[model samples]
Target: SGFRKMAFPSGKVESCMVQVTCGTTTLNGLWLDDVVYCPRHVICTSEDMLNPNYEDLLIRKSNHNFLVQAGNVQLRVIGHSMQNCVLKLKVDTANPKTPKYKFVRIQPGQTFSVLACYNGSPSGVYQCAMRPNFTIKGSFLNGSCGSVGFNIDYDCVSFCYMHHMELPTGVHAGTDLEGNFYGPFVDRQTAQAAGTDTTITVNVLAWLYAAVINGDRWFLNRFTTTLNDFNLVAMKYNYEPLTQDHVDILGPLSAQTGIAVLDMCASLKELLQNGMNGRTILGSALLEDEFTPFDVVRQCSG
Candidate 1:
């Protein structure tokens, strides 16, 4: 209950950027976070999520200015470090016809799909509900064919956990990935009864974080939509249960509250350790919330 574990800047670490290619290669501009089968990635491990260095504004953006390329297009995501945040984002310009909300900035750990998608769907090809009421919407005015199918053109993303005071949580499947069905891992009550609550808590958290980092929205949706899922012996290549409407509803709900995966993982870890007001890897106390939402825009990115 005291300010004992409090220290300054001892846990600082550099962030990492990686490239991931998915699906086809025709579309560009995506909502990221939707790729469920993405490879595993993380800026910090579960233990590192509690490190104090993640809270430091000075070093958080240290990895922001790295040069990356997408389809021969070299672009820079401007980073702004201030007293409270280290978020560097690429803000899209507002279109006169598009809604003002569509111009939101794309944050780190929520990237890749740079050339593939943005604000959801295949970049310019996938228009939103922002259709101006008129006899003819220009979205259909295009000369060529737009699509309903999906693909990925090797999106690029960089990630950092942005450590929190209360933090923490990896993976297995039964259908295909790791872990299996029939209670290979049980629910909270059953887990505790077996005296292995921490094991399941951390294990599931790891899965959530990897999906978030890899921008695998489908996997995140699957994992959360069915907690009974972990409770996975069957991995189907076409096993996507969370449809567009489901994510649309769920994403907005979480946005109003908080990003689900990050919060669930972080809070559960904190609850397990009972270290809310105590200390973290960085060692300071902020009255305000500093956790970063691990998701990008709510729309479906191709």
Candidate 2:
């Protein structure tokens, strides 16, 4: 696919034909042509690349100065500086009322790293600013650059409920039983497109995913069954015959589904404490089988 030309000291040039082919490697893990081909095309650069104003700031010198990496709902920061520096990281900058920040120090010739999220939670854009301590004179090759700091543009990390939607009815966010916060939301348009199915599917999946991340083995075992039922119910309303009518028809089903789910939660509560005198029963028990799986249909009637 290509050729290489070599020049000799005697001024003679030799051309060699080279064949090149691109593909992925499946030996260990999923990857494509190493560094040559990146599907996401993830790129990291110095702040100087965004603006030449901070060219003299050593923290913006190269990748060695600062690096941000993410996995699942976690973000990690690795930073260094030519001088003792204060590294301040902001996880949410857009919200002026409630912004998250962390501070750490990076000494000269040393690397400082820290975990960004101690509690697994939602994702957000993260930005960092480094301020070199000027008390220890001569830290900067040149005199202080007037400003003690430099900034990193921003990086993002994935977190639970990232796909949830916001609704005009109101977006409700709360902590799961396991104590992890989640936002129960969905795209208003998508909800209109999918009808009531969106409610059950998104709600179940949001809690299921959050629970799994919190290490709830009991709920995980029942998650697949719940997901399958929601999928089957979704197919029943695939056709365009009834618009808002579908909403009305699914109302009882939705109510029953919510109650059934709560019943499942209710079962986890402790009950029936007994004493020598008498016995007292607490939690509500399922008196009758209330959950009826929605009728699954292969195709909608024309």
Candidate 3:
């Protein structure tokens, strides 16, 4: 806290920086108290707390910048310091006296997303400060004290989470280039647990098909990698037996590729079941019933 910057003969200052020289510490930006046995030095800010330059100053150890959006904000680390750090923000921005809050850990060169939800609205300001890991402590300023003032404007918008699709009523089967097929579909759901059924639709199949048609292999590969990582297993294609772990993993993947893959497999299954020409499908109990592509993937992947 007893930090002073020496000025040059030409009326320019050398470095207006502060350094932490010891003991169990806490820095609440420009405020210093609890000096019973700690012999603490005090640091303070000007009238408007570094007014005109407040938005441009870089404070603390790991240099970073803040950008605010609707309900989310991003902290971008622009400096080269790779120190592990934690970010602190107010729990209730509207109520200045709110004492309870939490710290979010961030790394250098990374942009971290913070969800700041306020009283039914995402609008509020948070005073943020950074504290790096111990043994690597030093307080300095690029312009002013490294503490930041952040705020966001959010609208209390609501929508239905239950999503569905109204496919054409008269189609049974169809096909496209690269040996892909459609139709012979069935009504299926994932996780049949409360909120999961809202996503029962075949629209995702069209999305994935578009991705592949546009040569967006990156998305497909990422999807496949996710399935593989879940250790998807089934009796199809001479694969191993299905397990609870596979089903458990399907719940989350449903938020991404589950429905898409399920519809694709269902279409193919219908072709085989209906004795369509030159059509074949892997035989596995996991694929039968009101099976979703999520089920097929859980059984086939591994």
TM-score per prediction, in order, is: 0.19, 0.16, 0.18
Kindly report the root-mean-square deviation of model 1 from the true structure over all alpha carbons.
23.3
- lDDT tens per residue, model 2, 1-302: 11111111110000000111112100000011110111010111233223322215443334332222222211222322221111222221122221122222222111111111111211112211111110111121111111111111122111111111123333322111121222222212333121131222222222222232234434222322242343344445331121233334334433533433323322212111111123211111211111111111101110
Residues 76-147, candidate 3: write the lDDT tens digits: 323221111212221112322222222222221111111122211222122111111101111222221222
Q: Is candidate 1 or candidate 2 better by TM-score?
A: 1
Task: Count clashing residue pairs in model 3.
Answer: 8
Each model's C-alpha lDDT?
0.24, 0.20, 0.22
How many clashes in each structure? 32, 2, 8
Residue 281 lDDT in candidate 3: 21
**Best-to-worst lDDT order:** 1, 3, 2
| Model 2 poorest ten-residue lDDT run | 11-20
Residue-level lDDT for 10 in candidate 3: 14
Candidate that would win on TM-score: 1
Q: Name the 10 consecutive residues with the lowest summed lDDT in model 3.
A: 30-39
Candidate 3 has which clashing residue pairs, if any? 18-139, 59-146, 60-146, 232-301, 232-302, 233-299, 234-299, 262-293
